[PDB]
Symmetry: D2
């Protein structure tokens, strides 16, 4: 058995762990990211044993042309699309902090990548999943879809849209064999957050708000994705699986 | 006495009821909408008693220049901005239905008006509220911020972002004297929904999902906004006030 | 118009503020609490001007007999019951902390007052409101209905039940003219909690978790109750109105 | 390996699927239920292949003495308690419908089994889990913890308490190595529900409110429990995993 999974933001962090997990299970993966060079370096160092089973596609998820071509390339190469994991996401730069001082260009960029990218990915894959009569979509949202992360306004805003888009696809397509759920990770150690977590004071600060008193990992994010993408979640649809050491429970 | 409120989407529906209510209580209003012509007609038929206490400003909330100029005009005319009611919103045309068949242009327009417009409105008024040491923002979200409306994916997506943007401003600015909350209306009779609700068979399908078995009004939306904007809600911050006849409680 | 409101836990804190506000508005109030002596002293010092417009009734809300007698006495004296405010509640003693060390007796007591008491109150007033074809119920829940308060397990547990009971009544009776909503206060200064906040280090610790950087008051809880009990909230049903200075928004 | 799991309400429905699942994977189970005869009949027909690895304990979860003795017997027989699955639950009889016509005895029985039962089980196992420095608790709640089930007031009320108790345990004990989460199933076919589901009229009515247009199964509930109980959910704490075919997403 070998499902076809598309994973965005696949060259590092959560996306890399997710793509490797699908590969380790025997699935075929279309790994999409911004740099063809980085994708090849990732393939040589992390996906060496899978070589052929992973199709590396350069694509900016915020671009309709790139996304449509990536889905067309996936269909040409593997012949179906069973799972779509919309993982690509950005926080916005050092200036995308509180609302009033975040540059208009940064708000737009964060919304384009984090939300429009997910809309475009789903829009490109649904016709194929519909034809198949079955398909699974896992969106990587965040606890910021439920509570606001201080000093990260654009990001928080974008994640509220990710959660509702998730529920929208579930409601409109559950009757047609599609499953759509979101993982809502709390604080996870990745290249996106490493800058903050590397500073004792900031790390202590966020840990103070995590009852579990630990920072999550990309492997734990991949665990949740694999659960939502498989046979053990056939009745889970339109749901948010929060994986945050109880951060949102207080 | 008199507060200064900026109300977007003020020439009709909820926006009109909201603007008229602030005026009736003795406040001054900067009424922003897309058409100078319609704004004048509205001012003549609904706001004649208040004359100059209402500043009619043509503005597309999705446009940074229009919003910045509207805020500057409000400051010039009234001297402060005490309340911002981000009411303007669109559903998307008849093709903005389920996700896969919604025109990309429609998804971008709905996100631009419903979310970017709210970011731009808050980005422009916050600097002024901060210097005043007090400010209140009421965002008109929707129960679609909490559950998905079937066949209205872009709209549902945008409202998820509005609710989170609301919590973001509350979390980042509560300490500086700012209040930001959202009203989440269920089905309300307005120019935006009139077409559907006019048909008994369509109204009936909507009513079946409302335990109260009644369609809401613009007057009730205005009631919730006045509550959230005034002195009886000084400890309400970062909250969603759902007004849907129990639609979301089932 | 003079409405008849039954207010539980009326001799102190939120309940005292609520009863007082109904009286000041011209309504008649049946003030219920545990001690007739305390109620009379409360009546002499806070309700003097109203005299006969407030019926003081001794009642343990957890006791079916007391509740039924209190509703019968209200009908006899005033002839109708328009509003019921289920405010009475307890936190449990210093031993009702984390789950495993809370005495079974304390868990049972907290649940009986905070939950069974609300069930009994609603059960006793609903037949009358149904006959009147109109009635409003406001339950005083807590943000503990949505997130957990560390070291207050029984209390947190009880409030989850209050929130769902609220939703249950709204769904089953909204079509019959009944409205049922819940206020969910965050940290408020009242005798029930006014001992943790009293100690500088604790209050300070509490404030660090409230973005608005302030403790709420019973006057603000009364403000929310009045909104939910009246004419400005006719389409609000099955909702939880959070009043916490953005405590739950992060 | 070989964990020790306590599963309440283990003789039928979800509890039986959960119990069997732990056994099939090589874990040892203390199966608790109301009738020793039924547990033996079950041990005979469903667990015939594990004999010794499953300890049958008659116990009314609502009874502190029964619960304490059941935990004593599990420790004595197996030596530890690694997982507790609080599955036992009742809906109330035909008279436990809307709140006002719910016999007080039924409301009390539903709260004692569905809520006090969980408090007691958790109170009984937590000292041991803490001594071990590790432990996982999975509570079976319901979508009724989030929305109200029409005509099932006591049930709905109880499930709101279960969700918050879950968050309470997670928040107070996550730092001590304990995990506590809840599964919130939608409509599942079990002996507790077949009455309704069987009747064509009712099933259709139910299916109409489920976007996925299918009823859940005990096997799917066990799938969710195993996920929350194992190594793939080490960073999931204080969470509610909704499994309802999108029922709560609309
Ligand atoms: N780290 C955390 O605390 C945490 C918590 C919750 C969710 N997440 C999510 O994890 C996801 C993946 O990132 P990560 O942090 O796990 O590792 P990461 O940040 O190192 O990698 C993120 C990936 O997204 C890619 N990407 C960015 N914009 C893109 C675009 N327009 N098109 C295609 N690819 C693009 C980047 O190149 C990168 O490979 C993000 O969506 C993030 O929101 C992280
Ligand atoms: N009617 C409901 O059931 C309901 C429920 C929840 C929220 N709302 C919100 O109410 C708000 C107002 O609509 P309504 O239904 O009350 O009345 P309406 O739909 O008749 O009017 C909406 C107003 O928004 C204005 N507008 C649209 N785009 C704009 C832009 N780019 N810049 C400035 N103004 C713009 C329109 O011109 C119009 O005046 C919307 O945000 C809508 O989402 C309505
Ligand atoms: N103080 C806060 O921050 C806050 C926040 C949210 C909700 N509440 C709720 O307010 C309610 C009342 O307490 P408070 O803190 O507002 O004021 P308070 O604690 O000063 O007064 C509580 C009242 O409840 C009465 N009472 C207790 N048990 C009773 C019973 N069995 N029958 C009848 N009356 C009884 C007490 O005598 C007292 O008059 C409780 O339900 C509490 O959960 C308080
Ligand atoms: N059926 C559904 O759609 C659904 C959905 C969500 C949650 N649940 C929960 O599943 C649980 C069990 O019911 P089911 O439908 O899974 O299977 P079921 O109804 O066939 O079996 C329920 C079990 O609970 C046991 N039980 C009842 N009271 C008990 C007590 N006081 N002490 C010990 N055991 C007791 C019964 O004897 C029986 O073995 C309940 O808590 C129910 O709320 C069911
Ligand atoms: C919402 C959340 O968990 C934080 S997302 C922003 C992480 S960072 O870039 O500020 O380190
Ligand atoms: C109901 C609402 O606020 C917008 S979502 C439904 C749009 S329409 O189909 O009623 O035109
Ligand atoms: C604080 C509150 O709203 C009631 S629950 C906590 C009670 S105490 O521990 O502050 O006495
Ligand atoms: C159906 C369910 O999840 C529990 S609430 C309804 C119980 S019954 O009416 O199907 O017996």
């Amino acid at each position: 058995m070998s499902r076809v999974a598309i994973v965005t933001g696949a060259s590092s962090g959560n996306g890399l762990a997710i793509a490797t997990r699908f590969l380790a299970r025997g699935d075929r993966v279309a790994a999409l990211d911004l740099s063809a060079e980085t994708l090849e370096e990732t393939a040589r160092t992390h996906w060496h044993a899978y070589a052929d089973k992973v199709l590396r596609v350069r694509a900016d998820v915020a671009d309709e042309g790139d996304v449509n071509a990536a889905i067309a390339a996936t269909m040409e190469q593997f012949g179906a699309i069973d799972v779509l994991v919309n993982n690509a996401g950005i926080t916005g730069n050092s200036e995308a902090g509180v609302l009033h001082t975040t540059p208009v260009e940064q708000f737009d960029k964060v919304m384009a990548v984090n939300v429009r990218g997910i809309f475009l990915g789903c829009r490109a894959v649904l016709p194929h999943m519909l034809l198949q009569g079955a398909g699974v979509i896992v969106n990587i949202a965040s606890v910021a879809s439920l509570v606001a992360f201080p000093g990260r306004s654009a990001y928080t805003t974008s994640k509220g849209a990710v959660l509702q888009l998730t529920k929208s696809v579930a409601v409109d397509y559950a009757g047609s064999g599609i499953r759509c759920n979101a993982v809502c990770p709390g604080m996870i150690e990745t290249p996106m957050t490493q800058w903050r977590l590397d500073q004792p004071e900031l790390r202590d600060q966020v840990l103070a708000r995590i009852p579990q008193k630990e920072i999550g990992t990309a492997a734990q994010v991949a665990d949740a994705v694999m659960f939502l993408a498989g046979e053990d979640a056939t009745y889970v649809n339109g749901a948010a699986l929060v994986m945050d050491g109880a951060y949102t429970a207080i």
